[PDB]
Amino acid sequence: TSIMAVTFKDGVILGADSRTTTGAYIANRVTDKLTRVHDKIWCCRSGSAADTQAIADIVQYHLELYTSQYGTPSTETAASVFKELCYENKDNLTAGIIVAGYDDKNKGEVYTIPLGGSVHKLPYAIAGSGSTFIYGYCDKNFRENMSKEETVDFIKHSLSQAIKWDGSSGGVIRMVVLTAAGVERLIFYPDEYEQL
Amino acid sequence: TSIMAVTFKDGVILGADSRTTTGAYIANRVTDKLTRVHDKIWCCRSGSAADTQAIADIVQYHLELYTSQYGTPSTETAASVFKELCYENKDNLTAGIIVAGYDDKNKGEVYTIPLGGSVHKLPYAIAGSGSTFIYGYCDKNFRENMSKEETVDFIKHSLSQAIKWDGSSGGVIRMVVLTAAGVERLIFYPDEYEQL
Amino acid sequence: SDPSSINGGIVVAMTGKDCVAIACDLRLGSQSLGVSNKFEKIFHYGHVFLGITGLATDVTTLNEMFRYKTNLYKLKEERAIEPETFTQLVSSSLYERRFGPYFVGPVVAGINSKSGKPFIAGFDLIGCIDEAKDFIVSGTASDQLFGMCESLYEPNLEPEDLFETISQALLNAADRDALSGWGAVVYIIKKDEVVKRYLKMRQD
Amino acid sequence: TTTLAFRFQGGIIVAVDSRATAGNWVASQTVKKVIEINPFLLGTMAGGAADCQFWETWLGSQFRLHELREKERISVAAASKILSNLVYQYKGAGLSMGTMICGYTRKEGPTIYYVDSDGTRLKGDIFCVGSGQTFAYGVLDSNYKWDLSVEDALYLGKRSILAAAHRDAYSGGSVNLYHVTEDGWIYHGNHDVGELFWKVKEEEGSFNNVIG
Amino acid sequence: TQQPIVTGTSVISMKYDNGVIIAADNLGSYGSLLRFNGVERLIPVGDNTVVGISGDISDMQHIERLLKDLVTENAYDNPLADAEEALEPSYIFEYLATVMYQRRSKMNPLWNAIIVAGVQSNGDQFLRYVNLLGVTYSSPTLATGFGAHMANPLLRKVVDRESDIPKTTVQVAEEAIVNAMRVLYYRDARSSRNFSLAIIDKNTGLTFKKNLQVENMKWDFAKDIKGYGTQK
Amino acid sequence: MDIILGIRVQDSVILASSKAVTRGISVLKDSDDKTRQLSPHTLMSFAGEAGDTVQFAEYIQANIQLYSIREDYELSPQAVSSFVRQELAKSIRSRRPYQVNVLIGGYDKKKNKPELYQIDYLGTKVELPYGAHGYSGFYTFSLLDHHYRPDMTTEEGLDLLKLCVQELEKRMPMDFKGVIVKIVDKDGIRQVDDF
Amino acid sequence: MDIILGIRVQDSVILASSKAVTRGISVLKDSDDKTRQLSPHTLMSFAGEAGDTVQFAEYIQANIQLYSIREDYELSPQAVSSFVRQELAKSIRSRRPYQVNVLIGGYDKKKNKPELYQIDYLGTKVELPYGAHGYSGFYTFSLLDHHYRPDMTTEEGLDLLKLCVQELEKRMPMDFKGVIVKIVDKDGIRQVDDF
Amino acid sequence: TTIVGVKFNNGVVIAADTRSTQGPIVADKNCAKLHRISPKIWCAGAGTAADTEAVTQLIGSNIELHSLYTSREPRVVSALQMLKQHLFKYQGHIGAYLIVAGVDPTGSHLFSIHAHGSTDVGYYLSLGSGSLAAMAVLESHWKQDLTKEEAIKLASDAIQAGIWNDLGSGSNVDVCVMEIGKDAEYLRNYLTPNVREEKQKSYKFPRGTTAVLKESIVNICD
Amino acid sequence: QFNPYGDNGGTILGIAGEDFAVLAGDTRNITDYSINSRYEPKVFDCGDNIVMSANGFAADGDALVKRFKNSVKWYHFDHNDKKLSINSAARNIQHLLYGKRFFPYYVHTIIAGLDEDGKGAVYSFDPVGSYEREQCRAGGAAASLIMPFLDNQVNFKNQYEPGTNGKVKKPLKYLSVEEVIKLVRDSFTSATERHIQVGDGLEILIVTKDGVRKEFYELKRD
Ligand SMILES: *[C@@](C)(CO)[C@](*)(O)[C@H](Cc1ccccc1)NC(=O)[C@H](Cc1ccc(OC)cc1)NC(=O)[C@H](C)NC(=O)CN1CCOCC1
Ligand SMILES: *[C@@](C)(CO)[C@](*)(O)[C@H](Cc1ccccc1)NC(=O)[C@H](Cc1ccc(OC)cc1)NC(=O)[C@H](C)NC(=O)CN1CCOCC1
Ligand SMILES: *[C@@](C)(CO)[C@](*)(O)[C@H](Cc1ccccc1)NC(=O)[C@H](Cc1ccc(OC)cc1)NC(=O)[C@H](C)NC(=O)CN1CCOCC1
Ligand SMILES: *[C@@](C)(CO)[C@](*)(O)[C@H](Cc1ccccc1)NC(=O)[C@H](Cc1ccc(OC)cc1)NC(=O)[C@H](C)NC(=O)CN1CCOCC1
Ligand SMILES: [Mg+2]
Ligand SMILES: [Mg+2]
Ligand SMILES: [Mg+2]
Ligand SMILES: [Mg+2]
Ligand SMILES: [Mg+2]
């Protein structure tokens, strides 16, 4: 995997490649690594497919039950539930998750949860095997309060490079836009992003 | 280490950080990783300090003896001597060397020699532990036939990011400019490059 | 299977006023089994004395080797080897076997016949020279010997007093070590007389 | 350790050394390796030191509870079996105990039981236990007869420990002697090997391997 | 049984005449990768104690939550929660020390080295260390990780024993700490330039300083160093 | 291999060596002589690794016999033992060392004295009044410490030896099928046929 | 522990069991009886891991004795052997299994027939005319294949057994200090004192 | 060990502690870790004690023969080259960590060599177990254009940091000053801040306390 | 893999007189080659005229002392403020240690005080609870250095009466508090010289019928 989440003026955008590997074999070239845990709280999954899947399902269950009793949960709350699962089961899990959500009060927020199970609130976050190759690029090119079109380009160019160098990344670039307007799914094919 | 070599209009420039580590301890913070094997053929050293040092000394000896008999050697010739040592002793060496030199016929040339001992002629090359973090940046920002000032900025910005993310890199940024004019040594201190 | 603690044994050396002393235990065992109670670890070549602890086969081998070498030295030089020179010979010979060493802990002792100065020295298995004004210790009860010597010793002891100090240092150290003891020998060395005394110690 | 106990005409002799080791470091020379369980029962200790000390002390507490409940002193067989069943529960956990339960009762007469941390329990007339058991056996077996006198039996036991104290690097210090009769156990003193060896060497004319 | 993932490096500290000083950089390393740069590793408890933590950051965040919860629990049914029955540094330390040793005894340690700095209610300086093994010790100067090897030697030149504490001012003490932080930036490969520093004084109270930087660095001599031996 | 003993008395050296040769769960032979005559007044017993033992013993035997022919003279027991020790001392630092322990019993005709040398596979030599290799020593040394006297006769030495064999037969785990006993004195080497 | 044998003849079952108890390089005892009477007409011999052997034997003994008292009736050898097998079959998949091999010799009073059962520590049961555990079988089975006949008497069975012990004493590496022999027949269990 | 090297105005100074260890035991309380390669080229050694002494003598011997062959005073870079090629050939198995310094016709020099054969250049260096304690002092107090007296102070202070704070270092401070145009001065035990206090008691035994079995005169003459 | 044990160094020493007893210990605390503290006491007054030290792994040492101090407290509650005798304390400590037989306290424990006849008493333990009363015991890192010296000077081992042909032993006698402290100070200075984990300071706790007194002395800090 190569995954990222980036806050901007109107909210937050999540981004991911679509490659799933079993060794050097690509088990799925059209994977959906961006997953819904609530209406406007999503996450990017990296590491063990099975582990991240089981975690995401438990979180989705917790937040659905939270909503039934206390109404819409904050993005911080969602990240805390992810953390709790990742931290307490650190010995048995291989999960690097980025949590991203849109409140109306707090606007766009991004929390990253590495292997250990620590929580880190950031303006933007990158993760997965392919992220190593774009630390330099992302740091030089990220700006706060970007527009939607600028953030889409930032993610597209970033993941394009991550895909180009990482063999464990590839396929299509999926994106999910989180704003007050709603939820928008975007896809970008090789023939476009490869020749950037 | 973070090291690189970049060809440009007038010739070629080598670049390197100055950090030498023994574990997490910095044994030398002002190291000179750019080494002369001939008047206008230099190399960047990454990997084992002892191995790369012993190799560079043998190459310098070979090229001095070559010059006594057959005159100035080509950059390709120098790279071939490095390769021969790295390939034939691959089991006992940990050396990632970039060879860069200036001919008047061939102008600037860069050859990279990874762990295996293979040779790769490239427009520019990056290597060492810190290079992983700047593949994305360097690919997006490199252009052929750059000027001296553009190439210096490209290397300075690149190594600055490599240093920022890699703990095994740091200190000053040393550079060596190879052109028809001659040989020029450049140095850049933290107070400058850190805030780029 | 640790070569330095299969057979067991100890050696200690001390300086006094115009004199030196070197002492050793008599045990040779095979781990827990005590085999011999006559195995002396101190040898001499002319007026230079050499004690050796450690693997017993190497003790014997090195004695035979230094006898060999000091004999050829005397024939060619036409004089007895001195303690300072012999110390260097021991160091060279041990370091020659750097990557296949003799598992020993040698100790040189003697008085320089020209200057009259007392001299002692110790080595590690690989040849590193350890020179000392006061004392040298070696063997399986080296820790014990260090503690005894460091407390009991004082400078400029007379030969008769020095004998008591070195003897008590060895005896009490040996009694706290399972692989050392079973008898002891003490050499008192003056400029031109040498007295050798066997000590009465507990036989367990 | 070297410990022994043997049955004979005049009851039971029990003899032990007093050395404690931590590798080649001599930890003690004055350790008590016989525990007096009651006026008619003795226990010898060999192997791990806390293991022996703790469980044989615990053992005495169980036997005190037996005579309170049953109004009768516990048998040597039942005593040794409480210990063997105890260590068997711990089998594999790494206890190290080589023990001899020696005593007298009316129904049994003089009795010795060997019990070890493997769970082995054996009734017998002669046993030697510990790192120096073989050295003790050598002297004891070659001089043993059923018709030994109390005076000769006491000496043979003493001499057998001395033999092992000398040769075994992990035995020594001093010899503790006991004699068990129909009237109970009787202590026959602590004998330092420092003086005992030379006394025996001179008087007996033995130990000719040593420089006199 | 753990392995630490995201880690924090040295925490350094010392006593002075009226109180204590403690400092730690703002880095969260991911092996050789210098991953996170906005990490606060000094955590105040009340207005009289600062806990400095190195090692695993996920475990550091857990300890933050425990201290946060300790303040809440202490306030329950306690009219003197901001007076005589406030949390002391010695109480906070003993709690953590108990936890650290319990966790090591269950073979599931909190992979941290902790220094609790503060001032007691009677004015006495408090400075004590505890780590993943549950080992505890106190000294005029204390430091974790590389700090133990490089900072302590420098801080001990100022305060070498107990009698040197009354003779050491806050100006002298802070200067030594800031100097030590510079040396660590020169020589520790998992350190950062940015750091936080905290002073707990018996008179002026808790002063928490954020976003400090190492400065007045000597790099100029590097230009003269050419090659590794025979290069001119 | 396993049990080899040696006892030096007033006028002779007595060597006792077990007869069993075992491999696996089978005793292949019960009449094996674990000794070689090096010279008319020198006998060497041996025990250790299969193959190595005989190969080493015969190699020494050949060398001593060669010396005897060359000089028309018998080497002293001390001289033979020193030669044997050096060969083992070389061996231990070889590619494949001889894993052989030996006892050398001899009668020095110049000194008119019996001599017993114990040498292990490392090249560790000691002169002793009585000696043993392997597990035997754990019983016999203490036994001899008690019963041995320096001025004993050959007959007293054989009774002392019987006492050792009896103890070993009682307390040793393995059946070693008795021993072959040989005496070395001023008249040379002879075997006791009824033991 | 080590050597336990069993032979079923016309009218009886004969069990032979070694007397040695060894630990390390010392034979601690040479008169050990490696058997327990489970019932008047059923005898069980045992060999294996130290401690486990006796603990298991006495545990079975207690259970069979309990059954006898409850029902005022003696279980058949077949029934006892099946009970023993099941206990071992449970044991092998426990946290710490009993490492004990057993032979069960019994006389079925209802059938008027002797019966010998061989059961290993895994719970592997077989009824046999002759049986052995451990290394003994590698010698005794082939010997009995040759010399055994089904219609032999108890005296013929004892001579056949003497032939086994002699072979074992000749070819086995360890000294097992002879055997205790016991006979099981219509009249119950008795020990042969001179073997 | 703790060893250092410091460059100054007209030369270079090196220093070292005097402790030798075998495990947790102090084998030598006053050993000499400053080694003469040539009259004006000296070497400070850390690591395996015998290796540092043997490798410094071998190269020192070959340097002398080279000096006689070439009719020239030896250079530091020659010692550096010979030491590093020797150490590299043995792939680290010769555990010598050296600070090489000296003056020669080319000028004054300061280098360090590691066991595997890598060399460094610097104005201030430190090697050994107490190198971190020493480097902390060097990084704090070093400056460009040091005088002779300032460099000796800085070097000894760096060694003291090792002596007090590192358990692998102790006892005394040895120094060697190599100035251009002058003889090198070897200052053995330049500082001795670890003198043993008076003992509370004299353990001189009454004569006859030890029990003796035999006596004999030993012949040492021919 | 996580290793739950560590070594904090240091060494301790207990001597018993006629009407008094001392328990001494150095104040240095270490890990590997670093000094953690120059003054970290590990000899404690536990009440009822019992002093205690558990030297080795400090975390286990502190845990044990803490549990024993607590054991003394509950002994008073459960048995009408009865004084815990030194022999009873020793047995209690055995059970504390043996309770963790299969996951031991990595410490060598020593306690000192007065027995019920008013005479000086020292008890010493192995890590898993085996104990023994003695006149003399050293524990910890430098135990191997100090103990044989104590055998010689306290119990007069290997010392015979002059002129008696090694036949009459030096008679055993109690030492004065002045003489005992002399031996303690010399024992630690000697241990400090040759053991790297021992030094900084010496703290002695003296126990008489009047109570528990303290004395402190400087040791070498290298
Ligand atoms: C990139 C490919 C590599 O990190 C991504 O992290 C990707 C994330 C992803 C994939 C699918 C759906 C959502 C998110 N991860 C994988 O493709 C993952 C690679 C991986 C395997 C094991 C790991 O450690 C436990 C870490 C990363 N692929 C898988 O999990 C596949 C489906 N299964 C296997 O490879 C079989 N594994 C199972 C776990 O044990 C090892 C063998
Ligand atoms: C960065 C720091 C990491 O790769 C550079 O590659 C740097 C390159 C360099 C350094 C000095 C001079 C010229 C070029 N390399 C190092 O600093 C190097 C790190 C390294 C060690 C071992 C390796 O595998 C054999 C690979 C890289 N540092 C060293 O060689 C230092 C001087 N020595 C040690 O760390 C001791 N090593 C010796 C080899 O065996 C392991 C222990
Ligand atoms: C002789 C000396 C051979 O050791 C005896 O067996 C002797 C018997 C004995 C009995 C009671 C009191 C003292 C001494 N045994 C020892 O001295 C014993 C030897 C031994 C050590 C470790 C073992 O591992 C299980 C088994 C035997 N020594 C000790 O017990 C020493 C004093 N203590 C330790 O070694 C502490 N260890 C014990 C095991 O657990 C870890 C800590
Ligand atoms: C400090 C004390 C290290 O603790 C120094 O490096 C010191 C340097 C030195 C130089 C010249 C003269 C004396 C001392 N080194 C030592 O004192 C050294 C420590 C050491 C031990 C073992 C090592 O490898 C495992 C490396 C360093 N001590 C010794 O060399 C002692 C005298 N010898 C031994 O311990 C035996 N060696 C032989 C070589 O193989 C390892 C064990
Ligand atoms: Mg190499
Ligand atoms: Mg960096
Ligand atoms: Mg001894
Ligand atoms: Mg002994
Ligand atoms: Mg010290």
- For residue A21, what are the β-bridge partners? A26
CA E144/CA E150 separation, integer angstroms: 10
User: Which ligand sits nearest to residue B94's alpha carbon?
Assistant: 2
Ramachandran category for residue F66: left, alpha or beta (phi over 0 → left; psi -120 to 50 → alpha): alpha
Exposure of C26 by Cβ count < 10 A (0-12 exposed, 13-18 middle, 19+ buried)? buried
DSSP-derived secondary structure for D146-184: TT--HHHHHHHHHHHHHHHHHHBTT--SEEEEEEEETTE
Supply the angle between the helices G52-71 and G77-91 in degrees, to the nearest 10.
130
CA F58/CA F53 separation, integer angstroms: 9
Residue closest via CA to ligand 3's atom 35 equals D22
Q: Report the chain D residue with the minimal C-alpha distance to residue I169.
A: D195
Q: Domain spans of chain D?
A: 1-212
Experimental method reported for this structure: X-ray
Tell me the three state secondary structure of residue G13.
Answer: strand
Closest partner residue to B167 among E34, E193, E222, by Cβ? E34
CB A12 within 8 Å of CB A28: no
CA E80/CA B176 separation, integer angstroms: 69
CA H47/CA H25 separation, integer angstroms: 16
CA D120/CA D129 separation, integer angstroms: 13
CB B1 within 8 Å of CB B16: yes
C9-to-A47, C135, C182, C203, F137 alpha-carbon distances in Å: 60, 17, 10, 14, 20
Which of B54, B59, B29, B30 lies closest to B42, judged by CA?
A: B59
C50-to-C11, C98, D27, H185 alpha-carbon distances in Å: 10, 21, 31, 35
- For residue D15, what are the β-bridge partners? D4, D177
CB I124 within 8 Å of CB I113: no
Q: Which residues of H touch C (CB under 8 A)?
A: 20, 22, 25, 27-28, 31, 48-50, 53-54, 93-94, 199, 202-207, 209-218, 220
Give me the amino acid identity at C87.
T
Which of E33, E187, E28, B24 lies closest to E41, judged by CA?
A: E28
CB I222 within 8 Å of CB I60: no
Q: Which two tokens stand for residue H74?
A: 């030896």
Number of structural domains (chain G) is: 1
* Residues with Cβ within 8 Å of residue E191, at least 6 apart in sequence: E9, E10, E25, E27, E146, E184, E185
Please report where in the chains the tokens 């209610």 appear, as a residue: E121
CA D135/CA D168 separation, integer angstroms: 7
Fold (topology level) of D1-212? Glutamine Phosphoribosylpyrophosphate, subunit 1, domain 1 (3.60.20)
CA A172/CA A164 separation, integer angstroms: 12
| Domains of chain C, first to last | 1-204 (3.60.20.10)
CA C23/CA C152 separation, integer angstroms: 15
Ramachandran category for residue G24: left, alpha or beta (phi over 0 → left; psi -120 to 50 → alpha): left
Residues of F in contact with D207 (CB under 8 A): 145
Which of D101, D67, D109, D70 lies closest to D85, judged by CA?
A: D101
CATH code of the domain in which A115 resides:
3.60.20.10
Which of E124, E104, E105 lies closest to E114, judged by CA?
A: E104
DSSP-derived secondary structure for E145-193: THHHHHHHHHHHHH--SGGGSTT--HHHHHHHHHHHHHHHHHHBTT--S
State yes or no: is B94 an active-site residue. no
CA of I111 from ligand 3 middle (Å) equals 20
Radius of gyration of chain E (CA): 19
Sign of the torsion angle spanned by Cα atoms F88, F93, F98, F102: positive
CB contact under 8 A, H117 and B50: yes
CB E41 within 8 Å of CB E11: yes
Domain range for A28 is: 1-196
CA H12/CA H16 separation, integer angstroms: 14
Give the gap in angstroms from C-alpha H128 to the nearest C-alpha of chain I.
12
DSSP-derived secondary structure for chain A: --EEEEE-SSEEEEEE---EEETTEEEESS---EEEEETTEEEEEEE-HHHHHHHHHHHHHHHHHHHHHH-SPPHHHHHHHHHHHHHHTTTT--EEEEEEEE-SSS-EEEEEE-TT---EEESEEEESGGGGGGHHHHHHH--TT--HHHHHHHHHHHHHHHHHH-TT--S-EEEEEEESS-EEEEEE-HHHHTT-
Q: Report the chain C residue with the minimal C-alpha distance to residue H209.
A: C164
CA C55/CA C139 separation, integer angstroms: 10
DSSP designation for F72: T
CB G1 within 8 Å of CB G34: yes
CA of B190 from ligand 6 middle (Å) equals 10
Nearest atom, ligand 1, residue A23 CA: 35
Give the gap in angstroms from C-alpha C152 to the nearest C-alpha of chain H.
5
D49 labeled part of a ligand binding site: yes
Domain range for G28 is: 1-195
Which of C114, C121, C104, C171 lies closest to C14, judged by CA?
A: C121
The bridge status of strand I44-45 relative to strand I34-37 is unpaired
CB contact under 8 A, F26 and G171: yes
Give the residue from D24, D53, D199 with the most I CB atoms within 10 Å of its CB, the best one to mutate. D53
Please report where in the chains the tokens 């070689």 appear, as a residue: F36
Give the side-chain half-sphere CA count within 13 A for D78. 15
CATH code of the domain in which F138 resides:
3.60.20.10
- Give residue G165's Cα distance to chain centre: 15
Domain range for E89 is: 1-232
CA of H88 from ligand 9 middle (Å) equals 36
Number of structural domains (chain E) is: 1
CA I57/CA I9 separation, integer angstroms: 8
CB contact under 8 A, D49 and I130: yes
Q: Which two tokens stand for residue D163?
A: 């033999």
Tell me the three state secondary structure of residue B148.
Answer: helix
* Domain I1-222 -> CATH class: alpha beta
Give the gap in angstroms from C-alpha E148 to the nearest C-alpha of chain I.
7
User: With an 8 Å Cβ cutoff, is C30 touching chain D?
Assistant: no
DSSP designation for E221: G
Of H3, H14, H19, H21, the one to substitute when testing ligand 4's pocket (max ligand atoms within 8 A of C-beta) is: H21
Tally of CB atoms within 10 A around G89: 14
CA of I101 from ligand 3 middle (Å) equals 13
Number of structural domains (chain A) is: 1
CATH code of the domain in which H162 resides:
3.60.20.10
Give me the amino acid identity at G141.
F
Closest partner residue to B50 among H116, H122, H132, by Cβ? H116
Assess whether the C-beta atom of H165 lies below 6 angstroms from ligand 4: no
Give me the amino acid identity at G112.
N
Sign of the torsion angle spanned by Cα atoms H157, H159, H160, H164: positive
D128-to-B147, C30, D13, D16 alpha-carbon distances in Å: 93, 22, 12, 10
Which residue blocks in chain F are alpha helix, DSSP H? 52-71, 77-91, 137-147, 154-171
CA C27/CA H177 separation, integer angstroms: 50
Give the gap in angstroms from C-alpha D73 to the nearest C-alpha of chain G.
25
